[PDB]
Design a protein around this motif. Structure first.
Motif, mmCIF file in Angstrom:
data_model
loop_
_atom_site.group_PDB
_atom_site.id
_atom_site.type_symbol
_atom_site.label_atom_id
_atom_site.label_comp_id
_atom_site.label_asym_id
_atom_site.label_seq_id
_atom_site.Cartn_x
_atom_site.Cartn_y
_atom_site.Cartn_z
ATOM 1 N N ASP A 1 -35.175 -17.434 -38.603
ATOM 2 C CA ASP A 1 -36.018 -18.552 -38.194
ATOM 3 C C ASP A 1 -36.732 -19.175 -39.390
ATOM 4 O O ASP A 1 -36.881 -20.400 -39.465
ATOM 5 N N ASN A 2 -37.184 -18.345 -40.331
ATOM 6 C CA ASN A 2 -37.846 -18.848 -41.528
ATOM 7 C C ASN A 2 -36.876 -19.561 -42.463
ATOM 8 O O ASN A 2 -37.171 -20.674 -42.909
ATOM 9 N N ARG A 3 -35.719 -18.962 -42.748
ATOM 10 C CA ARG A 3 -34.739 -19.556 -43.655
ATOM 11 C C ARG A 3 -33.393 -19.624 -42.944
ATOM 12 O O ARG A 3 -32.728 -18.598 -42.742
ATOM 13 N N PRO A 4 -32.958 -20.823 -42.541
ATOM 14 C CA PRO A 4 -31.659 -20.953 -41.865
ATOM 15 C C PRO A 4 -30.460 -20.859 -42.794
ATOM 16 O O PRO A 4 -29.330 -21.074 -42.341
ATOM 17 N N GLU A 5 -30.659 -20.557 -44.080
ATOM 18 C CA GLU A 5 -29.536 -20.456 -45.003
ATOM 19 C C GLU A 5 -28.753 -19.163 -44.823
ATOM 20 O O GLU A 5 -27.635 -19.052 -45.339
ATOM 21 N N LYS A 6 -29.305 -18.187 -44.108
ATOM 22 C CA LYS A 6 -28.666 -16.892 -43.923
ATOM 23 C C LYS A 6 -27.881 -16.794 -42.620
ATOM 24 O O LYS A 6 -27.529 -15.683 -42.209
ATOM 25 N N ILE A 7 -27.611 -17.922 -41.955
ATOM 26 C CA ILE A 7 -26.817 -17.883 -40.727
ATOM 27 C C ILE A 7 -25.430 -17.295 -40.958
ATOM 28 O O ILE A 7 -25.021 -16.415 -40.183
ATOM 29 N N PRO A 8 -24.655 -17.717 -41.971
ATOM 30 C CA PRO A 8 -23.355 -17.061 -42.189
ATOM 31 C C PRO A 8 -23.475 -15.599 -42.579
ATOM 32 O O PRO A 8 -22.662 -14.776 -42.139
ATOM 33 N N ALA A 9 -24.468 -15.250 -43.402
ATOM 34 C CA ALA A 9 -24.597 -13.873 -43.866
ATOM 35 C C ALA A 9 -24.954 -12.931 -42.724
ATOM 36 O O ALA A 9 -24.378 -11.844 -42.604
ATOM 37 N N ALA A 10 -25.907 -13.327 -41.878
ATOM 38 C CA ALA A 10 -26.291 -12.481 -40.752
ATOM 39 C C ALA A 10 -25.170 -12.386 -39.726
ATOM 40 O O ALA A 10 -25.016 -11.358 -39.056
ATOM 41 N N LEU A 11 -24.379 -13.452 -39.585
ATOM 42 C CA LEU A 11 -23.278 -13.439 -38.630
ATOM 43 C C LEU A 11 -22.156 -12.520 -39.098
ATOM 44 O O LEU A 11 -21.561 -11.789 -38.297
ATOM 45 N N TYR A 12 -21.848 -12.549 -40.398
ATOM 46 C CA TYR A 12 -20.780 -11.708 -40.927
ATOM 47 C C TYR A 12 -21.124 -10.230 -40.801
ATOM 48 O O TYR A 12 -20.270 -9.415 -40.434
ATOM 49 N N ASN A 13 -22.370 -9.865 -41.104
ATOM 50 C CA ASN A 13 -22.773 -8.463 -41.014
ATOM 51 C C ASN A 13 -22.791 -7.984 -39.569
ATOM 52 O O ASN A 13 -22.492 -6.816 -39.291
ATOM 53 N N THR A 14 -23.155 -8.866 -38.635
ATOM 54 C CA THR A 14 -23.213 -8.480 -37.229
ATOM 55 C C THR A 14 -21.840 -8.071 -36.709
ATOM 56 O O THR A 14 -21.713 -7.071 -35.990
ATOM 57 N N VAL A 15 -20.800 -8.828 -37.065
ATOM 58 C CA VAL A 15 -19.455 -8.511 -36.596
ATOM 59 C C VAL A 15 -18.974 -7.197 -37.197
ATOM 60 O O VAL A 15 -18.343 -6.379 -36.518
ATOM 61 N N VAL A 16 -19.265 -6.973 -38.481
ATOM 62 C CA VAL A 16 -18.828 -5.747 -39.146
ATOM 63 C C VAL A 16 -19.462 -4.526 -38.494
ATOM 64 O O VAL A 16 -18.797 -3.507 -38.270
ATOM 65 N N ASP A 17 -20.756 -4.608 -38.175
ATOM 66 C CA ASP A 17 -21.429 -3.491 -37.519
ATOM 67 C C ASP A 17 -20.828 -3.215 -36.147
ATOM 68 O O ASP A 17 -20.720 -2.055 -35.731
ATOM 69 N N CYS A 18 -20.439 -4.268 -35.424
ATOM 70 C CA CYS A 18 -19.815 -4.082 -34.119
ATOM 71 C C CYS A 18 -18.491 -3.338 -34.241
ATOM 72 O O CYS A 18 -18.177 -2.477 -33.410
ATOM 73 N N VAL A 19 -17.698 -3.661 -35.264
ATOM 74 C CA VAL A 19 -16.449 -2.938 -35.495
ATOM 75 C C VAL A 19 -16.738 -1.478 -35.818
ATOM 76 O O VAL A 19 -16.012 -0.575 -35.386
ATOM 77 N N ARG A 20 -17.805 -1.224 -36.580
ATOM 78 C CA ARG A 20 -18.199 0.152 -36.871
ATOM 79 C C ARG A 20 -18.558 0.901 -35.595
ATOM 80 O O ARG A 20 -18.207 2.074 -35.434
ATOM 81 N N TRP A 21 -19.264 0.237 -34.677
ATOM 82 C CA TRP A 21 -19.607 0.870 -33.408
ATOM 83 C C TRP A 21 -18.368 1.091 -32.550
ATOM 84 O O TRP A 21 -18.313 2.037 -31.757
ATOM 85 N N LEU A 22 -17.366 0.218 -32.683
ATOM 86 C CA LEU A 22 -16.120 0.411 -31.950
ATOM 87 C C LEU A 22 -15.379 1.649 -32.438
ATOM 88 O O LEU A 22 -14.805 2.394 -31.635
ATOM 89 N N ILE A 23 -15.373 1.879 -33.754
ATOM 90 C CA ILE A 23 -14.687 3.047 -34.305
ATOM 91 C C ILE A 23 -15.354 4.329 -33.826
ATOM 92 O O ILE A 23 -14.686 5.285 -33.414
ATOM 93 N N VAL A 24 -16.688 4.368 -33.867
ATOM 94 C CA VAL A 24 -17.407 5.557 -33.427
ATOM 95 C C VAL A 24 -17.364 5.704 -31.912
ATOM 96 O O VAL A 24 -17.689 6.774 -31.387
ATOM 97 N N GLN A 25 -16.973 4.653 -31.185
ATOM 98 C CA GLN A 25 -16.830 4.776 -29.739
ATOM 99 C C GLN A 25 -15.569 5.552 -29.376
ATOM 100 O O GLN A 25 -15.553 6.291 -28.386
ATOM 101 N N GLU A 26 -14.500 5.389 -30.161
ATOM 102 C CA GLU A 26 -13.318 6.223 -29.975
ATOM 103 C C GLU A 26 -13.639 7.684 -30.255
ATOM 104 O O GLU A 26 -13.189 8.581 -29.532
ATOM 105 N N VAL A 27 -14.417 7.940 -31.304
ATOM 106 C CA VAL A 27 -14.971 9.258 -31.580
ATOM 107 C C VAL A 27 -16.035 9.496 -30.513
ATOM 108 O O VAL A 27 -16.424 8.562 -29.804
#
Lengths: 113, 160, 160, 160, 160
Positions: free
Chosen positions: D41-67
């Motif tokens: 909200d303070n700096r909208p320049e991090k929209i791509p950066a926060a979006l990219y990290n969010t997807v990567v973390d979701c994939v990490r949670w998917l891997i640990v879900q199989e485990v």
């Protein structure tokens, strides 16, 4: 100044380096801080030696210590004789080129007189 | 963090692990271990550090849970009580996850300051150069006394 | 630590191991062995050290428990007493765990001061230099008497 | 981005993943984590950066879900309750995808400025030369004091 | 190009892919992504570039469609509901195609100027030599000031 031949290089597993960076009050942090000061003071004297763990994980060892050297050939142009040629080039115009070793210098002074 | 949020946060991070696989008591046991060693109430700067160690310890207890039981040493099964036949073939999966988790601490907390001091070069900073130089216990190359000490060689590292 | 806490702690660390797999008498036997050698009552500083060794010895006893029985030397089974057939094909699982445990002692007690003195460089500390220099039994290079002894060469390492 | 768009975007990027495979609550949990750290909200320049990290973390949670479930450790199945027999022999598939995704961030957002500073050559730019030269903490080769300090050698990196 | 031709062109290029495998909505989603980043209405020179990225992104979404479903992780099947028996054994095929497509962009549009600047040799062109020489930010070898600056050494790259 930049001929760092024989400089000391140390290799340490990144697990220790990363743990120290995030846990300043962990045993890894103490040993890392010791290395940063011990390696700076590593001279040659009456008690100089090195002791490293000998663990091995792959074709390369975990811990190592080597002294670097130029992997190939050094400089070729021998900048020393470049300067000597240019110094004699400058002094010849003033007739005072004999310091690089009736004369030329005495005849040159007569012109000004 | 309080005693109830740690279980809630750990389960989400571990992909919704069930209660029977890991009890809430065991989570508290490892959580309490790091609380007293890092006095979190006195200094809250170690919340990410205590949280990271707690999750890693839980994975370690999960691996040893597969061991000490029949799950680890079996790799075949066959049931038949008549016409019903079943044949199928987490100890191995939990292993590499621990190695992977130890290499990606940002998955737990991004503020862990991971991977910042890999490469160290000495003598290129004034702060570090004077720290070693002014250390009273330092012994450098200019102290080579030789056969017997002489007053021409310094006995202290720091300049006068 | 009292005699009742050690069994409680070891079982939790070993993933809730049961009584039949390892009796409480055997745990006391290894616990008592390190108590008399490290006189824990006299010096309470050895609580982590005695605890770490106790768990390791228990794992060693677990490995030898698979040996001396039929579990270690078999890798197949087949029962068929009619319509019931069962076929399945921890000695090797306890092996690498003991190797892994010896490399991560912090899992037992973080205060073990593990991994602190890997790299040693000599002659870069005044404390280490004078301890070697002032040792009366030390023999260094400045004592080379050669053919026959002469008063021009020192007979003691320490400076006058 | 609002809380409703992120689930819509992540599901499309992940090939139309369903709700049971990954809940909308977990996506918000990782989305909120990067929101507070990057104050979008303070700096909208991090929209791509926060979006990219969010997807990567979701994939990490998917891997640990199989485990933490039986899916990871099984590679065979056989059901036979009469004339019906079924036999078949995503944990490993999610592995290399995470490796592949970390190498092609443009698939999430092309404006991530990926792959721009691979090769660095020092001393070939005035901007980089003076920044190092004018740094008060810098220590270079022209400061070699030797035995004892002398006024013939500079104590500061910057030129007068 | 309009919103309808892109689907028609993509399907032909992808060998007549069906609607269920890839919806027309998803094609528009990636097509719209590159339209706003390359403002195709403002500059029509990027029609081949936008088209190439659109097709590649569609293949990426196709690969992740096999993942997040049961198709990727299975490699056997067996059906029997009586006398009917069936046994058979695109995630792997879509992988190498993406690598192949990234190496043959001419298959999409021949005007992409692919494979033109592999080998670069410096100092053999007047246009490039003066571009570096006249750059005000350039720092070359003739600027070696040494211990302290002197007026005998240039401070700018360009000749007077």
């Amino acid at each position: 100044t930049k001929d760092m031949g024989g400089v000391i290089e140390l290799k340490i597993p990144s697990q220790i380096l990363n743990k120290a960076a995030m846990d300043p009050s962990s045993p890894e942090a103490d040993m890392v801080r010791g290395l940063m000061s011990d390696a700076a003071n590593a001279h040659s004297g009456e008690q100089s030696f090195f002791m490293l763990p000998s663990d091995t994980k792959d074709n390369a060892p975990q811990y190592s210590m080597t002294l670097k050297g130029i992997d190939g050939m050094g400089k070729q142009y021998s900048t020393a004789q470049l300067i000597s040629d240019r110094k004699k080039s400058i002094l010849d115009r003033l007739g005072a080129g004999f310091i690089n070793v009736q004369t030329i210098h005495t005849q040159f002074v007569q012109r000004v007189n | 963090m309080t005693n109830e949020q740690v279980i809630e946060l750990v389960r989400v991070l571990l992909g919704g692990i069930t209660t029977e696989e890991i009890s809430d008591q065991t989570i508290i046991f490892f959580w309490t271990k790091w609380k007293l060693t890092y006095d979190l109430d006195n200094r809250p700067e170690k919340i990410p550090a205590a949280l990271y160690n707690t999750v890693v310890d839980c994975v370690r207890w999960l691996i040893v849970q597969e061991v000490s039981s029949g799950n680890s040493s079996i790799r075949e099964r066959f049931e038949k009580i008549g016409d019903e036949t079943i044949s199928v073939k987490s100890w191995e999966s939990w292993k590499d996850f621990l190695d992977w988790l130890e290499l990606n601490p940002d998955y737990i907390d991004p503020s862990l300051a991971f991977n910042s001091s890999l490469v160290i070069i000495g003598g290129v900073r004034k702060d570090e150069f004077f720290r070693v130089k002014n250390n009273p216990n330092s012994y450098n190359g200019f102290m080579e006394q030789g056969v017997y000490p002489t007053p021409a060689i310094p006995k202290q590292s720091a300049w006068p």
